[model samples]
Target: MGEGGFGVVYKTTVAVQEIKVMAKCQHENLVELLGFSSDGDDLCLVYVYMPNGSLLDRLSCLDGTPPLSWHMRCKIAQGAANGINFLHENHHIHRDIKSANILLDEAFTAKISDFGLARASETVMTSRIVGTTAYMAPEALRGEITPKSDIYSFGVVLLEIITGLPAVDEHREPQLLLDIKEEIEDEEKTIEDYIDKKMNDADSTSVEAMYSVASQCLHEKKNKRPDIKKVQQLLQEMTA
Candidate 1:
């Protein structure tokens, strides 16, 4: 399987005449699209398969899987954000930006997938709402999507990395949303409280930088959110 989503996906072949081709291109952060095939009414796309599977399975650590280290998580976030930024520059919006949409290669490098649901800015506004509910930007929930919607979802993913909790976890005692709102609003809550306890707290500089980005992305108004390019710039500065 390439990467499982709402439905199962498998590699398959079809008629040679049905093939439509784009010049093979290479990028460290993008999964290479090899070719496409049409089998009657069904079309199949061939891509470079990443054996490690989706970020969701790794983050959840199902069946004794070890959770990603803080450094590894940061690398994953950086790479995924870079890829998204590249897409945005080319006029594509990866409307869905949840952990499940991030796939890892055998080396554990992260790449954003599931482009079938993607649309350009012009078409996105009129399209049906798509994307995981919890990670959806407030405006997207109202059927209004802009580049910032992707930024908002990216922020939610970053929050998940720092907190080690799903963006919306209902099983928690106070609930993740309440916990996050309280942490962000309360002057008294230390950065330690908002970060994953399992990981030794990130250094103050890293923590502060991440918090600033998350705060900006989570701004109540979608217009207030920074674009992915700006967010990527901030993250780059943080690492430098």
Candidate 2:
């Protein structure tokens, strides 16, 4: 697609070339690319319209809507993780893995979205850094893109879910890590103290279990991170 069509018409050019790359893959937890469109010059991607919209929409309720249940949050996490796992499995890299990238169905089942920056897993993207730096792995910030970077980004999402605080937002710095660590060390406050108030009904061990897994995923070293499969297993056992 190109703009300024031969000095005759006004046209907006969208990144049409990249659409086919994302169209190749599909999964239950990923917002599907149904098809595409192009009215001569204006190209657009047709995506599966999620009834519940983005995860951020649910999490950022404006009209006093209730937050997701504790079990539901964990379930969402697992689903999102599965989506990322599926991506990496096929040698794909989801360059953006923030809360906004996560969509939900009417059932609140999480689905990863917006694969505009996705590329082959083997390719280390250096020139352009896509996605949130706060959620990115150290290597990623250094312009070394990899699938494991998605794991690091997912960790930031997990932190946001377990704790009510905004650990990471779109392209912003993640806060409260040091404060959380100090609080955990303090005898007076337990990890549950930092948990979302909406999750008051959660099993005590469940919160701790998720925190353990999230902490591991946020490891500084990329190689130190656990595989998505293991993460799925841990969350499964924890919630079970």
Candidate 3:
């Protein structure tokens, strides 16, 4: 699919027919790639359209749209993890993993998108670092690419989901992490201290678990970070 970056995407009647036939096939977490076409010079890939638009838009909304519920956010995280797990297991790397790259369906289910930066492991070594600055993994920034990089970006996204704060909040002195660490370390700082105040009293247990998972993901040492599978298991256990 093309529109803004380096290509233009269009729909073809023949491709549309094939997509209708494939619509019967379903996967719980994977967004379907219905069909594709090439006009000799340009290519068009068609897929299901997300009515609610991008996750970034939803997260950025300030006008009192009902905030994402704890259960819903957890589900979104799990779904995203499942998608990443699938990609990694198949030797693909989603080099760019950020809130903006994630799209939401009408039901607000999160789906990973923008495979334009995706590449096979063999090709990853040669690929240039390309991703949102705030969500980029330290290793990626240093020109070392790995599945763990995606995990790091995921952790940052998890932090954003729970706290409703940008990865880097310039307005806060010493940055977001310093602010969060100060609050979390203080016994007087309730779990609420780390959560998005706009959530209107999130469940204490859920908020705590969210903090634990996000903190684990954001560990300074990449090896100290959890794999996507472990992350999924931990989140499941926490919610259980």
Candidate 4:
């Protein structure tokens, strides 16, 4: 049941290690591992089923689901930020942070999932790159992962919420979603130009504020990005 290389063996331990991380961290915005089952040498971990599926699906309206109102997206953003902040506070780096990994419950509350690539460390330098490249920070693409790496990925997700576009789309000129930062910074486009047109009720003022936070997260230098705590604080203030 094993391959010739150590890679398969390392893969085998991912779930068990993920369960270890999940069990140790408890936060309302984080997905809770309900239980696990083992049969023979195989294992499975169960988490509360998020009926609404992923934020990605909803953003794309994959199931005929109505577009999430701008207000709800903000709420989900805050919840996701809180979840990621908790992981960072515990000295964990969620190497895989993307809209697809952020699940939405019935009430549209965000829960961070897929801990297969998570690590309990301040920073990780690996031999190979991982995570969705479109959402990855430059350092992460080079296998240098810090908490700020997670911030960069979340910044993309936040962009998705605002623009209702996938992180990568062949139709877009830049293709990568984060490049919207370039257009905005260069004055080629305004933040309003990128707001999701599907949301008629979006408060433009609030969107400008959210865009400010997301752009900071997408900063080229990790040190230029706000810590998740400050992000949470900024997002929290928007809700108030």
Best by TM-score: 4
* Model 2 alpha-carbon drift over 4 Å, by segment: 1-18, 122-125, 168-190
Q: List the lowest-lDDT window of 10 residues for candidate 2.
A: 1-10
**Local accuracy of candidate 4 as per-residue lDDT tens digits, 1-240:** 122222232111222277778777668899877777777687667677777778998899886989999889999999999999889889999988998888887789999987778888746689977888898999999989788899999999989999998999998877988999899999999989999988978888889889889999999988899999999999988867
Better of 1 and 3 by lDDT: 1
Q: Candidate 3's error at 124, in angstroms?
A: 5.6
lDDT-sorted candidate list, best first: 4, 2, 1, 3
lDDT of each prediction vs. the true structure?
A: 0.71, 0.72, 0.68, 0.84
Query: Model 3 compared with the native: what TM-score?
Result: 0.79
Per-residue lDDT tens digits for candidate 1, residues 15-116, read 111121123245566666767666677667677776666677777775667788878877888888888887787677778888777878878888887776
Residues 1-240, candidate 3: write the lDDT tens digits.
Answer: 223354343332211232332343455555567667767786666777765555555666635566676677777887888877777766667877877666677687877766766666641454466776778777788777788888888887887788777767678754654246446656756557667766665688877887787778777688898988888888778668
Model 4 off-target regions past 4 Å?
1-16
lDDT of 2 by residue, 151-226 (tens): 8888878877777556443443325342364456565577777787765577778888988888788877799999
Error of 4 at 103 (Å): 0.6
Regions of model 1 farther than 4 Å from truth:
1-5, 10-25, 122-124, 173-179
Summed backbone clashes in each candidate are 0, 0, 0, 0
* Candidate ranking (TM-score, best to worst): 4, 1, 2, 3
TM-score for all predictions? 0.83, 0.82, 0.79, 0.90
Clashing pairs in 4: none
True-vs-predicted CA distance for residue 130, candidate 4, Å: 1.2
